[PDB]
Design a protein around this ligand. Structure first.
Ligand code: FAD
Ligand code: FAD
Ligand code: NAD
Ligand code: NAD
Lengths: 164, 164
């Protein structure tokens, strides 16, 4: 079989819906983070998530060298955080974390305490596939947030959820 | 660092949102499918997605031996399909594909033609983590899909999107 055109793969996926997260890290290689929707739960023992991130991202090599990361699922009111971490405004990495709502829990990675969900993690496995590194991380702590109406991304813009 | 309790991990994840897909297959080993939310896009060259499925399931066994599969991102009106393929109502595996919206495209896997996105795929690699196989699949065809607001899962209920 021949694979579909890269153009067709991306266009088709624009019609899917995803949550929006920020993946962040800190440690001796410095502070970095980026907006990521290619994230999912893998297994619950040991508890493990994965995230796929373009090796061309400035955050990629810093995350992999720090060895720890957080995954922060954003709430519907947090689209400006998603924009910041996607490179809009070109905010310097460190500056992205200036707001007091970013703290640490266990690893030293920045955790967004009012995200719908925030997992603090250590990297367990990295598999490089095409342009991206698929990073498997084990979850060592989490936040305890009240508001969790989701920020969603769909056909190239933000959305949230509705009943039905 | 100690990893969080399994119960605590599933708990937090209920507060995150996901898309809802059906993963299906057919071939020399038979017809099978199940509902899968742990799916994501990996890279666009070669166009590759991944999905995480428990190795204990009837469907996992057949998918892996057929070597081909489709991933079908469901639309907002299709919660009944998601329920069927999660085992709600105990519909026998092979009776699950009655509906005519299921057609063949390239590999012989059944593709849901009215799904928001339907990818027909060949398995490229499998990474085992805990109880799950993370299956990497290369996309060799797609449904050229009519417009569709997607099915989302959040807080143990189905939902769809709206605007901010
Ligand atoms: C909804 C959504 C979902 C997304 N999902 C994903 C995904 O799952 N995976 C993925 O890989 N991408 C994803 N992206 C893309 C991603 O967020 C970013 O890589 C992309 O947005 C590009 O980032 P950037 O413009 O910050 O460029 P980058 O070049 O990666 O980073 C720029 C930043 O690095 C910093 N920096 C760069 N160079 C230097 C230097 N020489 N010295 C000091 N600091 C420097 C700076 O402080 C600057 O602001 C997603 C984007 C959106 C909007
Ligand atoms: C919205 C939604 C999203 C879903 N997403 C996924 C997904 O991304 N991936 C996926 O694999 N399933 C997913 N499921 C589950 C899937 O659809 C089926 O429901 C699967 O065949 C479960 O059927 P069953 O519960 O009757 O298990 P069974 O009929 O009993 O099959 C065997 C059982 O699974 C077992 N088992 C279940 N969970 C674990 C575990 N975490 N570790 C070890 N053993 C386990 C046991 O080993 C036991 O024998 C999802 C379901 C819904 C409703
Ligand atoms: N990615 C998955 O394997 C997944 C996702 C949702 C539900 N299921 C399944 O749920 C069952 C029972 O009900 P429930 O309480 O989990 O619905 P639930 O929505 O209440 O459980 C919460 C969350 O756990 C996450 N997850 C990651 N690995 C998981 C795992 N091994 N088991 C359960 N969740 C996992 C999911 O994203 C899910 O939404 C199953 O027998 C089953 O196979 C599995
Ligand atoms: N997985 C990723 O790397 C990923 C995911 C989303 C967006 N992006 C990127 O998205 C931008 C805008 O995204 P968009 O949805 O608005 O429009 P888009 O038409 O460029 O992409 C549409 C969808 O295709 C998928 N996708 C796009 N590029 C991919 C890649 N290189 N590898 C794997 N999947 C990919 C994603 O699911 C994305 O949402 C960028 O400038 C950018 O680098 C990358």
């Amino acid at each position: 079989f021949e694979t579909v055109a890269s153009f067709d793969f991306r266009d088709a996926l624009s019609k899917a819906s995803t949550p929006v997260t920020v993946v962040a890290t800190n440690g001796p290689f410095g502070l970095a983070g980026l907006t990521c929707s290619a994230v999912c739960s893998v297994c619950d023992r040991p508890p493990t998530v994965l995230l796929c991130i373009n090796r061309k991202s400035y955050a990629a090599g810093i995350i992999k060298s720090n060895g720890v990361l957080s995954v922060n699922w954003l709430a519907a009111g947090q689209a400006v955080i998603s924009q910041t971490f996607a490179g809009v405004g070109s905010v310097p990495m460190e500056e992205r974390f200036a707001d007091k709502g970013w703290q640490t829990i266990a690893t030293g990675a920045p955790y967004r305490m009012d995200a719908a969900v925030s997992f603090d993690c250590t990297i367990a496995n990295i598999v490089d596939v095409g342009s991206h590194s698929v990073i498997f991380a084990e979850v060592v702590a989490r936040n305890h947030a009240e508001e969790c109406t989701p920020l969603i991304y769909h056909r190239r813009q933000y959305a949230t959820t509705r009943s039905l």
